[PDB]
Paper text:
Ribosome biogenesis is a highly coordinated and complex process that requires numerous assembly factors that ensure prompt and flawless maturation of ribosomal subunits. Here, we report cryo-EM structures of 30S assembly intermediates accumulated in an rbfA null Escherichia coli strain.
Particles of classes E (12%) and F (39%) conform to more mature assembly intermediates with well-resolved body, platform, and head domains. Moreover, the head in the map for class E tilts backward relative to the body compared to class F. The head domain is well resolved in the map for class F, and only the densities for proteins S3, S7, and S13 are weak and the density for S10 is fragmented. In addition to the appearance of the head domain, the density for helix 44 of the 3′ minor domain (nts 1407–1494) is ordered and well-resolved in the maps for these two classes, although the map lacks the clear density for the flanking 1398–1406 and 1495–1498 16S RNA regions. However, the reconstruction revealed significant distortion of the overall structure of the 3′ minor domain, including helix 44. Moreover, in the map for class F, the head of the pre-30S intermediate tilts backward by 10° compared to the wild-type 30S subunit. These data are consistent with the interpretation we propose that the most developed 30S particles of class F represent an immature pre-30S subunit that is rather close to the mature state. Our data show that the top part of helix 44 is displaced and protrudes from the interface side of the 30S subunit, blocking the final formation of the decoding center and joining of the 50S subunit. The presence of almost mature intermediates (class F) with displaced helix 44 confirms this assumption.
Author numbering:
A (entry chain L): 63 to 123
B (entry chain D): 1 to 205
C (entry chain P): 1 to 82
D (entry chain Q): 3 to 82
E (entry chain T): 2 to 86
The structure:
RNA sequence: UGAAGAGUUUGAUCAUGGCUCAGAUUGAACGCUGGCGGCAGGCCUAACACAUGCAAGUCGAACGGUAACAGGAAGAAGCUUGCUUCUUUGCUGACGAGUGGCGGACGGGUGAGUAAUGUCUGGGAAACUGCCUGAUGGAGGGGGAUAACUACUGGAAACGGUAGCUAAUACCGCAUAACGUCGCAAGACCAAAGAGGGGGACCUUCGGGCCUCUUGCCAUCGGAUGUGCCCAGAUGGGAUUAGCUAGUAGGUGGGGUAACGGCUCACCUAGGCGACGAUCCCUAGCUGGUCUGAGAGGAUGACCAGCCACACUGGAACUGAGACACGGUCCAGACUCCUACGGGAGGCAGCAGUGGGGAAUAUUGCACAAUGGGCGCAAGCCUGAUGCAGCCAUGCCGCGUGUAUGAAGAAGGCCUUCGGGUUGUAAAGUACUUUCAGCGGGGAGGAAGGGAGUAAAGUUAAUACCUUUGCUCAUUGACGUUACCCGCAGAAGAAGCACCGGCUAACUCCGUGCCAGCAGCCGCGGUAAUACGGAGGGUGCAAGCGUUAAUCGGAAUUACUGGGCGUAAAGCGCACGCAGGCGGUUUGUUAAGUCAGAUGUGAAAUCCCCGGGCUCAACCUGGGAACUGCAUCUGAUACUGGCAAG
RNA sequence: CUUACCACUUUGUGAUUCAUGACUGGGGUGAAAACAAGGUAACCGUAGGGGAACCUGCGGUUGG
């Protein structure tokens, strides 16, 4: 069981993702953490601080 | 990588004057010293035990212009040498060619000193050295290359240098612009208020 | 067979050589019997490009150790400089 | 006279050969206590000159059989 | 694969054929000495030994067998012959 | 040269005690960002399967040769005065195939297996050892082959078969024969090969003999090197594995081996190992080292070096100095490929590379210039070793991305108690500079050597030839348009990422409203919320920065150093008792522990100290120290042990 | 040609695992009043009754 962190979502019922350690104080059994931007996951939208942790690329400004 | 930001706001966080904006205009008339450099500058700066160790380490770095990786290496070497680590570290910082060019007058600020060193316009024992962290030893001869003895900025830096106190441990000539690192400065003749023990406590854990 | 040959050490494009007594079947700078001096090719005014300590070379040649050509050239140079 | 381990017979039932245990008093590597360690060791006596409990000197020789490379030197205490 | 391996294989077959012939002949003579020992004869076995011996020494000369092996056959066979006395 | 703590159980306390955090590290990975260089590192997973190329040859100074190239000598011609066309000639330089020699047992890969005869440390005795080296001696005289070749000749092919031919440093006799082997001795027995250069004189059956030098060949004995073998100690976990073992343990003989040996066999004996962990199961290449730690320890064994083991899987041998053989053999499998369906071929754990697995790991590069290695007298040839180059912020290290001053203290942004404040000397503008990137120009060092010509009566046919030295000449760099130096403009081409409640350096406004979200922990969010998103500001680090994983630390949280058991977890319900651990007192002795001295060993690298070279640093390197161990000898004798006597 | 050994191979017999299997075992899901003085201290072993968790017997403890 993995946690899709961040402010938004795109994952589906077969998509291929990458996961990393770290549990959430959620219901017992969640200890993995989907990597946003790594495979089928995407960086959250209109994110502008702690961007590298959500896979969102630098806005051209 | 150097530090390329505003010079005075770096001094205002440290509180004291750092000699990194040097010349005629005598800061606090340059610009608004003694408020930490931001929107909450007026806010009280009372800070913890780890904050004062950090503040002085930061201040020493900002004076010499050394980054945290080299400063950590300086500390490692100083703590490896024989003797007290704090004055070991200040001596390593003051044997830097950057610094020595500054302290010998030619070179207005340590960043202008570094501008000179980097730009192939200083000779240590008669050959061009352009590394700022190059260590000068007792009895090198730091000198401006001939091609750059006609530079107006080095000549201008020289005058505003005897108003600055001239270090005892090194002896310089302004006519034939050239100097001589005599000895490693002691802690005492390093005219400063650096409290090196909080620095050695910072990296000692 | 025992040969006195150069083991290439040092850094890249700054060769340093150990003069090593070795069984000829080993790798160039692998298992050796004895170190007998060194050779620094990139040292021009740089001092002491070659130390050999020729008593041990004499001992090992008296036992049928062959010399590489480069070590032989180095021995001539050391003898001439003397 | 080369090493002459000095031990005590523990079984004399192989013909022309005894088994000899050697006590060493070694210091424990981590706990620092001096413990006793044993080394049983098949030895060759040609003449069956040894009995259990005897205290015997042995020396090392060429391998006489599988697991037999020590030979008897003396009997120091023909203990009965 | 390699051409020196190709030659070295057929050279080994030729060497092996030569060697098998030679060491079979050596064993023939050695076994004739033996065959005489368990017949219990001293003259027959001494003759067999004295015609075995040049064969074993020459084959240890050319490296078919080691000298130690030659010294072995001769030692064993003389011990047997002399207890046979 | 060496040691830090904080948070969380309560209404509060103090203990206990776990959890979590602050550090260092990495063969990393991922996310965002990315200038230059130096130096290093780069399939950790599938010992998965592998297309293609390359990774081992070389020697004509062993040999028959002479396909092929180029020459000579010709011949026959065209007839240029002999200019070039065909045939022949190994006559020659040379050289494909073949014989023979040496190499292919190295170098290179990998880490499957292996829990201990593998490794490490330290010893040992019963062995062999190509090439190299020392010494001594020999090196006489014959033979029969056979590859190639020629002619047939089957097979799709791979691969063959038949008849004839031919050499040798191939092979086989014979002689000769210790310093060798067997033997107590007498005795007996055991070997070889030439080739090359030059040549006075002489001879020549005009081939050469003869002479001389060089090199090789045989034997024996040493050296050196390498390898085999033995022993002890050490080197994971499991007792929810307690018995294991019939070449099992020993002994006598045979045999075998280079050698000792149950190595093997026949007989005999009936042992051997095990609670100081046998056996069995599981896991694992081992070490120098590495990381972490004040240390003691823990964790590791990538790179580099040493040792082991493996080479599709399982067997086996041969050949050989050496192999039970990575690019050798055969036979058994399993795959793949070919096939004319008879039958064949193959093994990237070499380099590069492909697919595949995977979170993840690079070029199907250049060169043999250097250092090595193989062969060769050599010239040289070969060498995916190696030297380099490519790729990749993977690490480390250095340097850039400007410098000085500049208050209209500008606009603009943000906060405003609307006074301002802040961004902030920041920018702009003024001067200044030009590292590095770009362009031009110079230009080291890695190159020693080898080639040709030059004396010693060197050596002796004295000049030869060859050797050493003699100089002299010309020549050898993959990297490479090198490092570096010089000029050229022009600030010109060159900043990001995390964080800001506490731990923890750094706060405000907006938005949102127990939603959305955050989170390492404490926890935060129900109208503010310095904790969530944006901003503005600030902090930290910076060509990087965060996250994840993982190891040690913190953790005295397995406590040897360095903890506990009344109630926090923890004294067996109670005895008795074997093994085991421990042992009152005084002599004597011994000298095992212990201590001391010595010696030998503890590879190099690494680590540490002092230096040296790279413009500095990293990196490289010299010397040292260290390797805290192991063994041996000598000594001491308080203490512990032994032995004796009390 | 034939012995001796042997890898593999075939058989049987064994051990050991791997998966899955009704079942497990039903974890379920859906369907048929008193806080040591306080509806009857706090426990320990054991045995009974029953869907149990409780209650009761027998011994024991103060940690009432």
């Amino acid at each position: 069981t993995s946690y899709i962190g961040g402010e938004g979502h795109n994952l589906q019922e077969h998509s291929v993702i990458l996961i990393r350690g770290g549990r959430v104080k959620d219901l017992p059994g969640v200890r993995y953490h989907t990597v946003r931007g790594a495979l089928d996951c995407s960086g959250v939208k209109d994110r502008k601080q702690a961007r590298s942790k959500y896979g969102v690329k630098r806005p051209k400004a | 990588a150097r530090y390329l930001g505003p010079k005075l706001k770096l001094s205002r966080r440290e509180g004291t004057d750092l000699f990194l904006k040097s010349g005629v205009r005598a800061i606090d008339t340059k610009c608004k010293i003694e408020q930490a450099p931001g929107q909450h500058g007026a806010r009280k700066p009372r800070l913890s035990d780890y904050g004062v160790q950090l503040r002085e380490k930061q201040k020493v770095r900002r004076i010499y212009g050394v980054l945290e990786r080299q400063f950590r290496n300086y500390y490692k070497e100083a703590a490896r040498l024989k003797g007290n680590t704090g004055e070991n570290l200040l001596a390593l910082l003051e044997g830097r060619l950057d610094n020595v060019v500054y302290r010998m007058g030619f070179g207005a600020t340590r960043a202008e000193a570094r501008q000179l060193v980097s730009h192939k316009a200083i000779m240590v024992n008669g050959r061009v050295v352009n590394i700022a962290s190059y260590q000068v030893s007792p009895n090198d001869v730091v000198s401006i290359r001939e091609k750059a003895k006609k530079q107006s900025r080095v000549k201008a830096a020289l005058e505003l240098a005897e108003q600055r106190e001239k270090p005892t441990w090194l002896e310089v000539d302004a006519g034939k612009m050239e100097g001589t690192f005599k000895r490693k400065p002691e802690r005492s003749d390093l005219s400063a208020d650096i409290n090196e023990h909080l620095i050695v406590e910072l990296y000692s854990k | 067979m025992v040969t006195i040959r150069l083991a290439r050490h040092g850094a890249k494009k700054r060769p340093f050589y150990q003069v090593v007594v070795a069984d000829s079947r080993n790798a160039r700078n692998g298992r050796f019997i004895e170190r007998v001096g060194f050779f620094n090719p990139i040292a021009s005014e740089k001092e002491e490009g070659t130390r050999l300590d020729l008593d041990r070379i004499a001992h090992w040649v008296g036992q049928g150790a062959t010399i590489s050509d480069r070590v032989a050239a180095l021995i001539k140079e050391v003898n001439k400089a003397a | 006279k080369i090493r002459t381990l000095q031990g005590r017979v523990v079984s004399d039932k192989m013909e022309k050969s005894i088994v000899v245990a050697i006590e060493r008093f070694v210091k424990h590597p981590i706990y620092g206590k001096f413990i006793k360690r044993t080394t049983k060791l098949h030895v060759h006596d040609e003449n069956n000159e040894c009995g259990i409990g005897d205290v015997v000197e042995i020396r090392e020789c060429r391998p006489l059989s599988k697991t037999k490379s020590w030979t008897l030197v003396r009997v120091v205490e023909k203990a009965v | 694969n390699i051409k020196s391996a190709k030659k070295r294989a057929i050279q080994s077959e030729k060497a092996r054929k030569h060697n098998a012939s030679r060491r079979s002949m050596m064993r023939t003579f050695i076994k004739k000495v033996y065959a005489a020992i368990e017949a219990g004869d001293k003259a027959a076995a001494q003759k067999a030994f004295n015609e075995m011996q040049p064969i074993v020494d020459r084959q240890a000369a050319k490296g078919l067998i080691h000298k130690n092996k030659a010294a072995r056959h001769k030692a064993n066979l003389t011990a047997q012959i002399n207890k046979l006395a």
